[PDB]
mmCIF file of C-alpha atoms and ligand atoms in Angstrom:
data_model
loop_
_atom_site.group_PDB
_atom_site.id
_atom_site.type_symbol
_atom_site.label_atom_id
_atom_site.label_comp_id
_atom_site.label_asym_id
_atom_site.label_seq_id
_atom_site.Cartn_x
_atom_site.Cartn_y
_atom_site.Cartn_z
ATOM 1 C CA UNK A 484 -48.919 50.798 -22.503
ATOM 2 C CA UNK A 485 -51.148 50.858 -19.451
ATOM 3 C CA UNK A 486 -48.301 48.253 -17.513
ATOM 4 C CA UNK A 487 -45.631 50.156 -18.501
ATOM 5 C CA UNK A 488 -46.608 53.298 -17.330
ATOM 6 C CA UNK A 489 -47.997 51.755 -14.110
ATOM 7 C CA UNK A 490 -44.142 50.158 -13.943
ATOM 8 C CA UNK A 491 -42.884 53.625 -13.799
ATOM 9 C CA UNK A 492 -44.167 54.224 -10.333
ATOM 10 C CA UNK A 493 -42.898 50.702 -8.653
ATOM 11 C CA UNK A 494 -39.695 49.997 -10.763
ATOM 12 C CA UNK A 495 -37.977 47.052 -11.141
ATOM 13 C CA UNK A 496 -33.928 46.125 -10.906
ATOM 14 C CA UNK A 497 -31.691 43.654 -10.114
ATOM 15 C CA UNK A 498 -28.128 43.123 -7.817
ATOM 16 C CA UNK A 499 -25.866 41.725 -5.380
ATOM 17 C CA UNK A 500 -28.226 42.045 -2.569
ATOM 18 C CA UNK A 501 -30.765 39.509 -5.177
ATOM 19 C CA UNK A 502 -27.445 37.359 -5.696
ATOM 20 C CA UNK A 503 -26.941 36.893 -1.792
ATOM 21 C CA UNK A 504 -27.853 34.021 0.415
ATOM 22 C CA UNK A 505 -28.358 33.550 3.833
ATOM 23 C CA UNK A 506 -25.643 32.714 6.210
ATOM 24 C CA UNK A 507 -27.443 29.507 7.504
ATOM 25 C CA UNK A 508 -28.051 28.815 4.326
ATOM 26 C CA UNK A 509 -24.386 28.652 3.075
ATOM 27 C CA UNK A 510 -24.048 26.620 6.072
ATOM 28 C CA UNK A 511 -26.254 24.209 4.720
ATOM 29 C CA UNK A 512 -25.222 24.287 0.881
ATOM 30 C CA UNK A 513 -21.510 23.692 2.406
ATOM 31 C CA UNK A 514 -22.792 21.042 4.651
ATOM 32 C CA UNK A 515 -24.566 19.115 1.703
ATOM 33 C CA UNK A 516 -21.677 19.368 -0.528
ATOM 34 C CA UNK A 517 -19.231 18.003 2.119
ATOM 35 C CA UNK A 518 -21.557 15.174 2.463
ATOM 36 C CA UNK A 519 -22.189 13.951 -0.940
ATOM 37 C CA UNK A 520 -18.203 14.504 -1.202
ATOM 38 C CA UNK A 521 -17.539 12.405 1.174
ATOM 39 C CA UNK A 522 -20.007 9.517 -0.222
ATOM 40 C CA UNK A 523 -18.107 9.843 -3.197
ATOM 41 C CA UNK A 524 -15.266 8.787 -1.970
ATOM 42 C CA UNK A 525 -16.921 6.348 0.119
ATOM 43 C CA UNK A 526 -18.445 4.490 -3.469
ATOM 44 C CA UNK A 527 -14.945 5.266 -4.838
ATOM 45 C CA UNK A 528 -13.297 3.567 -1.688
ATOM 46 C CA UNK A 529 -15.594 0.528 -2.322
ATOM 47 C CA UNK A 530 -14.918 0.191 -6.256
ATOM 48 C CA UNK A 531 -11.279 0.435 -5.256
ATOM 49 C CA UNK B 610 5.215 -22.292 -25.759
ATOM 50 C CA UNK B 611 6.883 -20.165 -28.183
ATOM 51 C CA UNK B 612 9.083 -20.002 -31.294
ATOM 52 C CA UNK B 613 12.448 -21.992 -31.714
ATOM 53 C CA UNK B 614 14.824 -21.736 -34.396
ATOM 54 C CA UNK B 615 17.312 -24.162 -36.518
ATOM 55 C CA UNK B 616 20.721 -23.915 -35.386
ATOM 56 C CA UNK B 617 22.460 -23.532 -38.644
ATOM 57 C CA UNK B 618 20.964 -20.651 -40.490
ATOM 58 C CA UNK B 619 18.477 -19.579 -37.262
ATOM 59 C CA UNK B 620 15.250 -19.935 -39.176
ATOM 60 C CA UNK B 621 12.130 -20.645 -37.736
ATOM 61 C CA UNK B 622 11.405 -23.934 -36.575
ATOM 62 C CA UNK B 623 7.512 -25.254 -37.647
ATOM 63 C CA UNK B 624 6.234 -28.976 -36.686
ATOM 64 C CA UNK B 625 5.719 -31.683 -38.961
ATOM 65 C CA UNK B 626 3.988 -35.349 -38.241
ATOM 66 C CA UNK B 627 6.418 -38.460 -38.771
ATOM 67 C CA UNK B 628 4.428 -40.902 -40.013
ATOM 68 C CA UNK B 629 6.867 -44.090 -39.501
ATOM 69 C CA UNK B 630 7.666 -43.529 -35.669
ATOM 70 C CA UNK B 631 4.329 -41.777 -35.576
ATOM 71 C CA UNK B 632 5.774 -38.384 -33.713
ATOM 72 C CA UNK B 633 5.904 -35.131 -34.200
ATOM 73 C CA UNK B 634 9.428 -33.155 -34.790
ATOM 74 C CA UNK B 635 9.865 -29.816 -36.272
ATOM 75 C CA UNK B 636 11.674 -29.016 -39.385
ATOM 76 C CA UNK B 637 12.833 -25.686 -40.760
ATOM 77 C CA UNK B 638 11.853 -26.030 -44.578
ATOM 78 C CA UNK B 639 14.721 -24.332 -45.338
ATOM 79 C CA UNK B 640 17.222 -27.293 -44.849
ATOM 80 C CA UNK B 641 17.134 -30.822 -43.261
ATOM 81 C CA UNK B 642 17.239 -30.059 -39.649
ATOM 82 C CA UNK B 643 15.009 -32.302 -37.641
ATOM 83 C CA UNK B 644 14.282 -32.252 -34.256
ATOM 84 C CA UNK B 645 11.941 -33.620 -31.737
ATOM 85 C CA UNK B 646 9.696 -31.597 -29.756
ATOM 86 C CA UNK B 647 9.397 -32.016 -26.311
ATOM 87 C CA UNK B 648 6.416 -29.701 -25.463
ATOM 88 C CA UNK B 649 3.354 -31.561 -26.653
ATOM 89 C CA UNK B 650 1.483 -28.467 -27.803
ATOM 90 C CA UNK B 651 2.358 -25.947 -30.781
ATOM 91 C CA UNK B 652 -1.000 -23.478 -30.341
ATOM 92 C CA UNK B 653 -2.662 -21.940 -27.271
ATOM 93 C CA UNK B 654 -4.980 -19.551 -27.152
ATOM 94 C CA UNK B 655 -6.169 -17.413 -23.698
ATOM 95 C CA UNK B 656 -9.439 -16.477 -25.140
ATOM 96 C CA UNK B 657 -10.899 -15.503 -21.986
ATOM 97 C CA UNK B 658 -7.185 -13.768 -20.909
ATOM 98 C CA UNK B 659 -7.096 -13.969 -17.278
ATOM 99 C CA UNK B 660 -3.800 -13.335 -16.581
ATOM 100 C CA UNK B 661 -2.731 -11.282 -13.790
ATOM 101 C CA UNK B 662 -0.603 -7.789 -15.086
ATOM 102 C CA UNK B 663 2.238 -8.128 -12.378
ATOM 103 C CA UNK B 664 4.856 -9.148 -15.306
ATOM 104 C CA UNK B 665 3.686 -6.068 -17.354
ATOM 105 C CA UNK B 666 4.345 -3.330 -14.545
ATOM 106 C CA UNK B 667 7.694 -2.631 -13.553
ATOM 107 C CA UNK B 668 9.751 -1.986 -10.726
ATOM 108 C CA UNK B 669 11.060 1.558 -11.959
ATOM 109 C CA UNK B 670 7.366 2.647 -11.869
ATOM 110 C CA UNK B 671 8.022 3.732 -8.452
ATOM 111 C CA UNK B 672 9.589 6.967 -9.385
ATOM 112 C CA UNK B 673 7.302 8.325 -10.771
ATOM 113 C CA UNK B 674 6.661 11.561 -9.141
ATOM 114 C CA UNK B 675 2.850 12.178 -9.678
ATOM 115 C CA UNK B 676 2.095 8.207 -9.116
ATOM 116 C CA UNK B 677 -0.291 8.218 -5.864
ATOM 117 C CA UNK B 678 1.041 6.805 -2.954
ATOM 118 C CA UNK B 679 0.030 5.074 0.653
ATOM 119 C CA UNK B 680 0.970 4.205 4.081
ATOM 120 C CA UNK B 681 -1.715 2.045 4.531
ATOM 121 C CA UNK B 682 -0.500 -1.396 2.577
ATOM 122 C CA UNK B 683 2.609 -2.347 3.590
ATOM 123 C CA UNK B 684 4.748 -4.635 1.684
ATOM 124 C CA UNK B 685 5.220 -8.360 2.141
ATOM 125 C CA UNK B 686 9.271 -8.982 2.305
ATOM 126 C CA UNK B 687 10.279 -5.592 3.558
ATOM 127 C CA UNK B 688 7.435 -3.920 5.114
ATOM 128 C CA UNK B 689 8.616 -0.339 3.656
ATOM 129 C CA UNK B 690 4.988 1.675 4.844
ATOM 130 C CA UNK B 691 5.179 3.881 1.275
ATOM 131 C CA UNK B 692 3.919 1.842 -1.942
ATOM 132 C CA UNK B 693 2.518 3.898 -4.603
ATOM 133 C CA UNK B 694 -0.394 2.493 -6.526
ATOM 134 C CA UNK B 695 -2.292 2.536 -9.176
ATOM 135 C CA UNK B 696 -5.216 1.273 -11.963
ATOM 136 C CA UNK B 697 -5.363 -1.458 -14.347
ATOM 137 C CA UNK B 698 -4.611 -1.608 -18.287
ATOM 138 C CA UNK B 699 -5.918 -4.851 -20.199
ATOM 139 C CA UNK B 700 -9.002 -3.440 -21.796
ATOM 140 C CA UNK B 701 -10.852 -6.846 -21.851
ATOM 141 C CA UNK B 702 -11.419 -8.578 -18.343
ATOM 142 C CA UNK B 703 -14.748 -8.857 -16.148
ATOM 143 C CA UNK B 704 -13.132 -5.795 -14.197
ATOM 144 C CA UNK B 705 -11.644 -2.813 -14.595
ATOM 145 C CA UNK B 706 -10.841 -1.009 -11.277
ATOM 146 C CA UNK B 707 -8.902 -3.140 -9.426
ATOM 147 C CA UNK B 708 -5.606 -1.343 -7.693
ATOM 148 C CA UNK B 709 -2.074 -2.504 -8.421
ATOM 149 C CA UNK B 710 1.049 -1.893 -5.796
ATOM 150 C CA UNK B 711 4.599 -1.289 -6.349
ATOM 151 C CA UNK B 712 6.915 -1.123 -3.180
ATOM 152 C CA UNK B 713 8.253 2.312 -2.941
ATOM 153 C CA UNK B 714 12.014 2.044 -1.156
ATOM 154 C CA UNK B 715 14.912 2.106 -4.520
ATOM 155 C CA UNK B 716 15.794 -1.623 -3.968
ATOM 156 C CA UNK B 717 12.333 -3.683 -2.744
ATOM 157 C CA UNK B 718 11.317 -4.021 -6.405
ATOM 158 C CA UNK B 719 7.897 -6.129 -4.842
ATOM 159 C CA UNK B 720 4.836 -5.744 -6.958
ATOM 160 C CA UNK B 721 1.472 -7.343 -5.544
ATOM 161 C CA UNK B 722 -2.315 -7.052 -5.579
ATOM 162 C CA UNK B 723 -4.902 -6.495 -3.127
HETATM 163 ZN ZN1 ZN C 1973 17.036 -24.332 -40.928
HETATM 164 ZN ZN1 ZN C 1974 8.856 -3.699 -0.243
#
């Protein structure tokens, strides 16, 4: 009871704005995932 | 080796020992044909099967429109640049990833493995 209430003044949600990274940080993500694509086809390049 | 047959009603051939002459001939038990045999061995077995698959794939393989292909391995005879390539099929062999080439051009029928 007492938390709820006490909710009612601060409020809580959720949206995009929660969803959304950095731009450096899709930088990085994209950085990292063009990396460990490219060492895949580095260990498939090796197997073949 | 591989299977003969008698020449008068094309049955199989299967060997038998001559005991006399001490040699071996085959005879199709289904007359009197006798004949000698001139390869010494009537059973082989590849237990281990290590034979290469360039007599299974054919040259007509190269057609095929969503085969992969390179530049980068140029054939021996012609050197055509474009040989499309692809993976293995024996399911039994101490590797299975090995790539197998086919010559692209409609009359180079050269298959080869690197
Ligand atoms: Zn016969
Ligand atoms: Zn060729």
């Amino acid at each position: 009871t007492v938390i709820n209430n006490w909710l009612l003044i601060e409020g809580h949600t959720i949206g995009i704005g929660d969803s959304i990274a950095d731009s450096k940080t899709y930088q990085d993500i994209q950085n990292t995932i063009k990396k460990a694509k490219q060492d895949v086809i580095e260990v498939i390049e090796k197997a073949h | 080796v591989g299977i003969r047959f008698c020449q008068e009603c094309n049955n199989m051939l299967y060997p038998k020992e001559d005991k006399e002459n001490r040699i071996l001939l085959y005879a199709c038990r289904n007359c009197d044909y006798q004949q000698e045999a001139d390869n010494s061995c009537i059973y082989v077995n590849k237990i281990t099967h290590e034979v290469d698959e360039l007599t299974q794939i054919i040259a007509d393989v190269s057609q095929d429109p969503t085969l992969p292909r390179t530049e980068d391995h140029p054939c021996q005879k012609c050197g055509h640049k474009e040989a499309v390539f692809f993976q293995s099929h024996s399911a039994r062999a101490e590797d299975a990833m090995r790539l197998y080439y086919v010559c692209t051009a409609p009359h180079c029928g050269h298959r080869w493995t690197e």
